[PDB]
Design a protein around this ligand. Structure first.
Ligand SMILES: [Zn+2]
Ligand SMILES: [Zn+2]
Ligand SMILES: [Zn+2]
Ligand SMILES: [Zn+2]
Lengths: 49, 58, 383, 615, 49
């Protein structure tokens, strides 16, 4: 299954959900790349919540 | 990742690397362990392949 | 416990059961004539700066309007641009669309209708999508209407198709800013009465709730588009009565092409500016070399009929002795007019004028209400 | 006439000049034209007040044709019988026809209305304890029948086998028999709790047909014709749920019996313990006081020495008074002993469900005597435009016969001519090109040919599966499953197996290579196998029907005869004498003259326990 | 079963819609009326080799 993530969708996720942007700042420049971070987030319980 | 089906007798997981390609053998005893390890490792190689594709496009 | 098939036959043929019909049409016509009796010489803003906001959302993909909503609005906007620049030449106009939550300005505020026609034709090809933003369109129009001079009235026409809008900020602050800038907004809605559009129209039009219009069918949309070409009557509190400086250019004749001052292209004809001797392609436009309006006498003449509109002609009484058996303007014989057997000359088609008392038929009456704007009898009177 | 002066332009009209009827002043609102010669009614659909007359005509008249603009109806006796039965009195019909017609209603038409409508409902056939009694409310009607006296308030018992003769004789006399089942007031037959499931929706045309059947509150025996895939089986289920009596259903194939059992157990609240099947494998009957039994025409009408179990089941069927019979594919009822299934079974109500109500002989006109009047006609264009059935593009490809093939066509007998005009190489090329083109479009294609040798030759030449009579059943199922699911198999070649009732996957293209003479029934049955496609919900979808015929042969005559029924339904067969892509297709079957000559010569080549061991 | 995400820059995605338009064009070819059905083939030459 494939889902399309536009850049504007990423910005809307950051604006509507500051918790995701907080997880974006301390992980993506540090440990893993941005698509890996989003694939981890979409399979996490945080996305379901 | 080459995986064995549940109908087969021996459970073993084959790993294929990239640049001669490196090949590794991972045999297991229990079928639930194979299921969990293959879904976790398939998810992480899917994430890494998506990251590599995004880096190659950029 | 029964069944639908066991019921008695519908017998719809047996359900069908089979003069003064002209009276039944003419009472509705008189109600139409009664609505035209409110004739007043209200002061209207001739010089207008109209901003046409056209929806280009997902609700524009609805097929309640033939063939889709978006194409019909674009075509009727083309017709509206043609009619508006035919009746209001001095007035300028810009076109904004709301697409994907953003206000896209597709033609700058200019007096040339051809650019707006080309812009609307270009927008007709694209597919509407997105969730419309009223606040973005209002802010873009506010930015567009900011350099408009005080004598030129600031009007916005919003053709809103959707029922809900998503804004990036508080739309009430935008409404208050538009009220503070004397910008009048008229909204034509497609589906139902949206409360924010009604509030915006009421605030911008000094409490007048009649500027929010919703269609009923195809022809009602045509009538609502044709209603907006008339200049809006201004309020008494508006004191922007300023003299406007313009010159009347002369159509230069030359067999040698010359560079125009507006487009820098080779045009044979033109209009030399009476102030700075610079030529332009078309009229009425600002002079590109000295920022002066350049109009003709006909451009002023097109908007005089709003300033002195004719009083509507009165239906003649049936018992009143008619002056002429035929018409006065076109000498058409008024018919026997017997709607029923003993009708005699009931609802006689003569329309008495209020000054010259001349008789006009219904064809002449609707022709003076549409194409002409002067009563022939009032001019034939030796005053 | 009305003293009308004959014009010189009325010379070639064979007494059909109806200009003596004075035109009404308010005629333009009235959409009808009544012809006094034969009761034919001309309706204009485009005028106002057309549907409010269209329902009146479909209640009181039989539609000859229903094209787009002008509809043509027939006032007949049987239509008037159903008209008065559903509650339309005689004066109401005359008053409405007078009100809704431009020309005045002629006195001959009015007298026909009075004559056909009166003397109806006098003689009635009732069944009491598996015994047929003909009953009349008036005494002297018994004494005026002295010719066909088969006697064995005022009623006398007739024999069970002689009921058809009585119905024919009373139809010849001005007293037609009334066949209505008052199931509401019938208490001798035990009721059933059969009822439709609430999840099952019924289409409005099916509701209209059942309102024609159950108009007066009493079940009326008759015939209902619907297109294939329009849900005639559901109409049968709903009729059984309406009557709520013991139901016997007759079919033509055992697979049809299985399908009818499946449809009964799915759409309505009938337990499997109330359902019984009388086939070769299954012969167990329901043990309850009432229920459903489904069987085949052949086993019920078997004159041969049947088995003991089948004899016991037949005795159970005959000794039980049935409240309802559903005859699927009623066009085969007028056969020799398929006629007798209405005599061997005492059924109060008889509903004949069909799709192809035509036969090449006149015995298709005997079903009003056997089952009852033709209750409902489905408008196939009206169902196609509403998406209930597919919008087929009927066509007829003209394949010219080659020089060496046509020479042999004329110096041959008709039986060999039949084989020879099928196998012309231009028909091979046309069929191959159509298969390639419609396979590139992604269409499931059925190629019908009644000739077995032609079917095999076409399939071997084109590399496609073929199904005919001698194919094993498991191979047929495997081929059909590959046709339904495998995308590499989009074309199946079917013989007359596909014409009769077998289950097929959904197909959108049909190519008719050959045919069984002028069988209109087979033509409409073949068209019915592409009329129920799944893609009907798709906008702009059209199914395709090709009848590949050899030019200047007798196949043209039979093809026109077969198409004569479908043009009555409204289908237009556009001729195709040219196919764009003939010269540019990669492979042409029999393109070289030597290959055509080889094909021609191949077609012509077709025509004491101890002494027992020594013996 | 397995999850895949697509990080898009929103410039290629429009072209992706054009690709969908290509599929829509294929949907026009699947439902296309054949050339012998839309017009009369009488004036053309007869079918053959
Ligand atoms: Zn210029
Ligand atoms: Zn100037
Ligand atoms: Zn006049
Ligand atoms: Zn006047």
């Amino acid at each position: 299954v494939n889902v399309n993530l536009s850049r504007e969708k990423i910005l809307n996720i950051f604006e509507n959900y500051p918790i995701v942007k907080k997880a974006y700042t301390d992980n993506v420049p540090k440990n893993f790349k941005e698509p890996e971070f989003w694939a981890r987030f979409f399979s996490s319980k945080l996305f379901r919540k | 990742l080459q995986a064995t089906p549940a109908s087969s007798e021996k459970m073993m997981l084959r790993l294929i690397g990239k640049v001669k390609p490196q090949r590794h053998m991972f045999s297991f005893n229990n079928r639930t362990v194979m299921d969990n390890i293959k879904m976790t490792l398939q998810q992480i190689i899917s994430r890494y392949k998506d990251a590599d594709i995004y880096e190659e496009k950029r | 416990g029964g069944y639908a098939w066991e019921d008695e036959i519908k017998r719809s043929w047996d359900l069908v059961k089979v003069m003064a019909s002209l009276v039944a049409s003419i009472v509705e016509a008189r109600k139409k004539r009664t609505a035209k009796k409110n004739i007043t010489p209200y002061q209207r803003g001739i010089i207008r700066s109209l901003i046409l906001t056209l929806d280009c959302s997902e609700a524009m993909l609805e097929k309640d309007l033939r063939p889709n909503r978006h194409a019909m609005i674009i075509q009727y906007a083309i017709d509206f641009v043609h009619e508006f620049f035919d009746q209001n030449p001095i007035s300028q106009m810009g076109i904004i669309i709301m697409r994907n939550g953003l206000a896209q300005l597709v033609s700058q505020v200019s007096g040339n209708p051809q650019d707006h026609i080309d812009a609307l034709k270009s927008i007709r090809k694209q597919e509407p999508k997105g969730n419309p933003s009223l606040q973005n369109a209002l802010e873009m129009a506010r930015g567009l209407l900011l350099p408009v001079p005080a004598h030129c009235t600031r009007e916005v026409l919003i053709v809103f198709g959707s029922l809900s809008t998503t804004d990036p900020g508080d739309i009430h602050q935008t409404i208050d800013s538009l009220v503070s800038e004397k910008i009048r907004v008229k909204v034509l809605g497609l589906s139902a009465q949206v409360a924010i559009c009604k509030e915006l129209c009421k605030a911008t039009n000094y409490g007048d709730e009649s500027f929010y219009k919703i269609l009923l069918d195809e022809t009602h949309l045509k009538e609502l588009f044709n209603e907006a070409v008339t200049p809006l009557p201004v309020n008494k509190i508006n004191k922007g009565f300023t003299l406007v400086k313009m010159g009347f250019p002369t159509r230069i004749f030359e067999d040698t092409p010359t560079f125009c001052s507006c487009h820098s292209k080779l045009v044979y004809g033109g209009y030399f500016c009476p102030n700075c001797h610079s030529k332009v392609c078309s009229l009425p436009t600002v002079c590109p070399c000295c920022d002066l309006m350049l109009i003709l006498s006909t451009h002023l003449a097109r908007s005089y009929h709003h300033l002195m509109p004719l009083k509507t002609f009165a239906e003649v009484p049936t018992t009143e002795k008619f002056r002429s058996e035929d018409c006065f303007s076109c000498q058409s014989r008024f018919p026997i007019l017997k709607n029923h057997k003993n009708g005699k000359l009931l609802t006689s088609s003569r329309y008495r004028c209020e000054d010259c008392k001349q008789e006009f038929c219904v064809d002449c009456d609707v022709f003076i209400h549409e194409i002409l704007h002067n009563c022939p009898g009032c001019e034939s009177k030796p005053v | 006439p009305a003293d009308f002066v004959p014009d010189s332009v009325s010379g070639m009209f064979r007494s059909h000049d109806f200009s003596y009827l004075r035109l009404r002043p308010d005629h333009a609102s009235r959409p009808l034209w009544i012809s006094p010669s034969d009761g034919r009614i001309i309706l204009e659909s485009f005028s106002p007040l057309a549907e409010q007359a269209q329902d009146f005509l479909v209640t009181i008249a039989e539609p000859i044709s229903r094209p787009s603009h002008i509809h043509e109806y027939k006032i007949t006796a049987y239509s008037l019988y159903a008209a008065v039965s559903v509650g339309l009195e005689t004066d109401d019909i005359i008053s409405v026809l007078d009100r809704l017609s431009k020309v005045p209603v002629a006195e001959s038409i009015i007298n026909f209305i009075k004559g056909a409508t009166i003397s109806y409902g006098k003689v009635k056939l009732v069944i009491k304890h598996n015994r047929y009694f003909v009953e009349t409310t008036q005494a002297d009607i018994l004494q005026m029948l002295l010719n066909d006296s088969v006697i064995g308030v005022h009623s006398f018992e007739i024999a069970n086998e002689s009921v058809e003769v009585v119905k024919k004789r009373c139809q010849e006399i001005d007293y037609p028999v009334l066949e209505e089942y008052d199931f509401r007031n019938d208490h001798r037959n035990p009721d059933l709790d059969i009822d439709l499931k609430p999840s099952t929706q019924i289409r409005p045309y099916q509701e209209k047909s059942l309102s024609k059947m159950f108009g007066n509150g009493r079940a009326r025996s008759g015939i209902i014709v619907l297109p294939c895939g329009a849900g005639k089986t559901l109409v049968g289920i709903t009729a059984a749920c309406t009557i709520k009596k013991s139901v016997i259903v007759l079919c033509t194939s055992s697979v049809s019996v299985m399908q009818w059992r499946q449809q009964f157990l799915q759409w309505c609240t009938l337990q499997p313990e109330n359902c019984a099947v009388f086939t070769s494998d299954n012969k167990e009957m329901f043990q309850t006081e009432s229920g459903l039994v489904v069987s085949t025409y052949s086993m019920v009408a078997n004159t041969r020495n049947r088995s003991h179990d089948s004899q016991k089941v037949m005795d159970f069927l005959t000794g039980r008074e049935w409240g309802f019979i559903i005859l699927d594919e009623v066009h085969v009822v007028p056969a020799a002993m398929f006629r007798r299934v209405v005599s061997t079974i005492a059924a109060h109500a008889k509903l004949g469900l069909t799709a192809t109500l035509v036969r090449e002989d006149d015995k298709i006109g005997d079903l009003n005597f056997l089952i009852g009047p033709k209750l409902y006609e489905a408008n196939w264009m009206e169902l196609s435009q509403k998406g209930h059935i597919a919008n087929v593009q009927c066509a007829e490809v003209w394949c010219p016969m080659t020089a060496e093939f046509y020479q042999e066509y004329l110096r041959e007998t008709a039986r060999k001519r039949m084989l020879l005009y099928i196998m012309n190489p231009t028909k091979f090329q046309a069929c191959q090109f159509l298969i390639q083109y419609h396979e590139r479009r992604g269409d499931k294609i059925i190629v019908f040919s009644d000739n077995v040798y032609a079917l095999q030759e076409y399939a071997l030449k084109m590399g496609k599966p073929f199904i005919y009579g001698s194919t094993p059943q498991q191979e047929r199922m495997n081929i059909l499953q590959n046709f339904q699911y495998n995308d590499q198999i989009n074309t199946i070649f079917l013989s007359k197996v596909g014409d009769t009732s077998i289950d097929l996957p959904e197909a959108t293209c049909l190519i008719q290579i050959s045919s069984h003479y002028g069988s209109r029934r087979q033509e409409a049955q073949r068209l019915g196998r592409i009329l129920r496609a799944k893609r009907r919900n798709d906008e702009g979808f059209n199914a395709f029907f090709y009848s590949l015929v050899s030019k200047d042969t007798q196949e043209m005559y039979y093809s026109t005869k077969r198409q004569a029924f479908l043009v009555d339904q409204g289908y237009a067969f556009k001729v195709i004498t040219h196919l764009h892509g003939m010269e540019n297709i990669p492979n042409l079957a029999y393109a070289s003259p030597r290959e055509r000559r080889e094909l021609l010569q191949e077609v012509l080549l077709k025509n004491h326990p101890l002494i027992r061991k020594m013996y | 079963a397995t999850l895949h995400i697509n990080i898009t820059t929103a410039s290629d995605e429009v072209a992706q819609r054009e690709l969908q338009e290509r599929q829509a064009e294929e949907k026009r070819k699947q439902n296309a009326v054949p050339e012998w059905h839309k017009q009369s083939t009488i004036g053309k030459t007869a079918l053959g080799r």
